[PDB]
UniProtKB/Swiss-Prot annotation:
Species in which this protein is naturally found: Pandinus imperator
InterPro entries listed in its UniProt record: Scorpion_toxin-like_sf, Scorpion_toxinS_K_inh
Additional comment: Pi1 analog that is synthesized with a phosphorylation at Tyr-33 (P-Pi1) suffers a 200-fold decrease in LD(50), a 200-fold decrease of potency in competition assay with apamin, and a 58-fold decrease in inhibiting Kv1.2/KCNA2 channels.
Function: Potently and reversibly inhibits the insect voltage-gated Shaker (Sh) potassium channel (isoform alpha (B)), the mammalian voltage-gated potassium channels Kv1.2/KCNA2 (IC(50)=0.44 nM), and the calcium-activated potassium channel KCa2.3/KCNN3 (Kd=330 nM). Its effect on Kv1.3/KCNA3 is controversial, since this channel is voltage-independently inhibited in PubMed:9464266, but is not affected in PubMed:10931199. Furthermore, this toxin competes with apamin (a small conductance calcium-activated potassium channel inhibitor) for binding to rat brain synaptosomes.
Family as reported in the entry's similarity comment: Belongs to the short scorpion toxin superfamily. Potassium channel inhibitor family. Alpha-KTx 06 subfamily.
Cellular localisation: Secreted
Marked site (Aromatic residue of the functional dyad) residue numbers: 33
Name of the molecule in the record: Potassium channel toxin alpha-KTx 6.1
Site annotation Basic residue of the functional dyad: residues: 24
SUPFAM superfamilies according to UniProt: Scorpion toxin-like (SSF57095)
Length: 35
């Protein structure tokens, strides 16, 4: 798991912490709650 692909997967692990509006992706890596 090292190629962004943050189309919804990263959103699951991170959602546990944050809520629904938790998703963000950058070449370097996946991210969440950044808006």
């Amino acid at each position: 798991l090292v190629k962004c692909r943050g189309t919804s997967d990263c959103g699951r692990p991170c959602q546990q912490q944050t809520g629904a509006p938790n998703s963000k992706c950058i070449n370097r890596m996946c991210k969440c709650y950044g808006a």
